[PDB]
Design an enzyme around this catalytic site. Structure first.
Site, PDB file in Angstrom:
ATOM      1  CG  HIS B  41       9.780  26.232  42.055  1.00  8.08           C
ATOM      2  ND1 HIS B  41       8.437  26.027  41.907  1.00  8.08           N
ATOM      3  CD2 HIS B  41      10.405  25.307  41.303  1.00  8.08           C
ATOM      4  CE1 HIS B  41       8.237  24.976  41.124  1.00  8.08           C
ATOM      5  NE2 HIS B  41       9.420  24.546  40.712  1.00  8.08           N
ATOM      6  N   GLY B 143      10.805  17.532  36.714  1.00 10.36           N
ATOM      7  CA  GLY B 143      11.164  18.086  35.414  1.00 10.36           C
ATOM      8  C   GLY B 143       9.950  18.680  34.732  1.00 10.36           C
ATOM      9  CB  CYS B 145       8.062  22.769  37.636  1.00 10.67           C
ATOM     10  SG  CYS B 145       7.941  21.785  39.155  1.00 10.67           S
TER      11      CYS B 145
END
EC number: 3.4.19.12
Lengths: 306, 306
Positions: B41, B143, B145
């Site tokens: 993503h 922040g 991920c």
């Protein structure tokens, strides 16, 4: 979101751990620049520990009696001095992984991370509070002495604890990195016991603010209290007194939630006097006192509306 | 003694964390050999998140569109492919700090350490279980991920988790390092909900063996039980069924403590029905299920890692 007991990343500390042997005694040392730090009882035997004379024992030791290993490689010892309860071994090699660091002496209620080590090698990392009785509730086996506690602030490692010993109730005692014990303990084999342990109130209040932020407000009340009254009730329940420094430190959490410190203190006074009627806060049946206000602020990252 | 929720030392994993930016999206990557792994993503925007066509988005990106930063140094991206929900970025440089590692897919009830990272920088380490509903009860902010979970066995880091997202109940979902989600979850903004979460029975028993080893044995009764008896009580309290495989796995702890599995099961059945009457186990009012039998043995043996 979510809330966890969380340690500092251990890597900058793992880069400083060494093994130190004297005679048949092995424990862990901390290698910073050209110095290695370890508990001075490394120069002892089991028999010496009954009434040890550290000055005399160290006198009869040369540099060659200290075998310092950094993984495979041996470090040559060039000098040895004692500072309070820590040995300092000067070596011919500066640690190339020495982080930016400082030695700090922490206060009861302040947290830190512990890197448990055996033979110069890390086993695990966990978060600890200095209890009001100057003990910590660690996890340490024989060989763990010289394991350190630390914080990271910016990229700077603040070393605050070196592990020395376990007390009869299974709690642990140690020194700062200048070798001064936390608490009324000595590195001698004599009947010691930890004092009555009190609850870290400023950390219980920080945790209550954490509860509120993660949605639990069932315990809140419209009442407010004064600080001496709160402290008199706190005293009764083996809670540390709340000082003005503590009120100051809770300011950010108070501001974020709009719940004045003394309002939350009134909520706590109520919970202490009545009990909690088998209701969990943040999935805990008991009030948690090893989360500081700074710990809650970091994890919650909330805004304040002014 | 002492028993603490203990994470693996994080240093080997801290040397692999990098920042990955694509357009205005920044999150964390894992740099092993000449490959950087991150959530796919990163190639999305808030726009794309509703229902993203990852294949099409990735085709329209060149190597030049990926900025990989490892502290101050920028890494050249030389290649990119997608495996399930992870992006792999080939870089021109093998990570010189690459540890011995492997990728594993864990089972529900297996534990691991999370290194929480923000902009390629490690901030915290904590111990987690894969819940029976394939969520983890983490602590992650925006922040985070591409933060990873891991075990260490021998000198070998087993990477098992990469963080992708938060579910509406505040629990966390992600993937193994081959990019397959744990549980029925997808990397799009869709109505997705965690299933019924149960307690990990075999882990509660491991924890009771830990308590005993550490001297907290007040809860031990003289009663024995059949496996089916235990299960029929356990089921009522949202406890996983205990299987013969589970009894086998507790063999080492049974042997070390000289207390039979089904004895310990009878002690648990008693605790479930009657509560703790104010007493705590290892300082805890609640039964803990985030320790595996291997976790108890490692901590009580003082196992170290390279």
């Amino acid at each position: 979101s979510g809330f966890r007991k969380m340690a500092f990343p251990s890597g900058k500390v793992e880069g400083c751990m060494v093994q130190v042997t004297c005679g048949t005694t092995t424990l862990n040392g901390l290698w910073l620049d050209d110095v290695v730090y370890c508990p001075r009882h490394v120069i002892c035997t089991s028999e010496d520990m009954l009434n040890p004379n550290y000055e005399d024992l160290l006198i009869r030791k040369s540099n060659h009696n200290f075998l310092v290993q950094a993984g495979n490689v041996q470090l040559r010892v060039i000098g040895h001095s004692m500072q309070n309860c820590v040995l300092k071994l000067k070596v011919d090699t500066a640690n190339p992984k020495t982080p930016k660091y400082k030695f700090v002496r922490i206060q009861p209620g302040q947290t830190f991370s512990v890197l448990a080590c055996y033979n110069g090698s890390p086993s695990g990392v966990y978060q600890c509070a200095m209890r009001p009785n100057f003990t910590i509730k660690g996890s340490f086996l024989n060989g763990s002495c010289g394991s350190v506690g630390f914080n990271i602030d910016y990229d700077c490692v603040s070393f605050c604890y070196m592990h020395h010993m376990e007390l009869p109730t299974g709690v642990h005692a140690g020194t700062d990195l200048e070798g001064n014990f936390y608490g009324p303990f000595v590195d001698r084999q004599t009947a010691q016991a930890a004092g009555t342990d009190t609850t870290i109130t400023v950390n219980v209040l920080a945790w209550l603010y954490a509860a509120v932020i993660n949605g639990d407000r069932w315990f809140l009340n419209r009442f407010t209290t004064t600080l001496n009254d709160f402290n008199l009730v706190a005293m009764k329940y083996n809670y540390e007194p709340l000082t003005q420094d503590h009120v100051d430190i809770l300011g950010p959490l108070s501001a974020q939630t709009g719940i004045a410190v003394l309002d939350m203190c009134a909520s706590l006074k109520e919970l202490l006097q009545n009990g909690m009627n088998g209701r969990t806060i943040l999935g805990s049946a008991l009030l948690e006192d090893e989360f500081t206000p700074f710990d809650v602020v970091r994890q919650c990252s909330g805004v304040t509306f002014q």
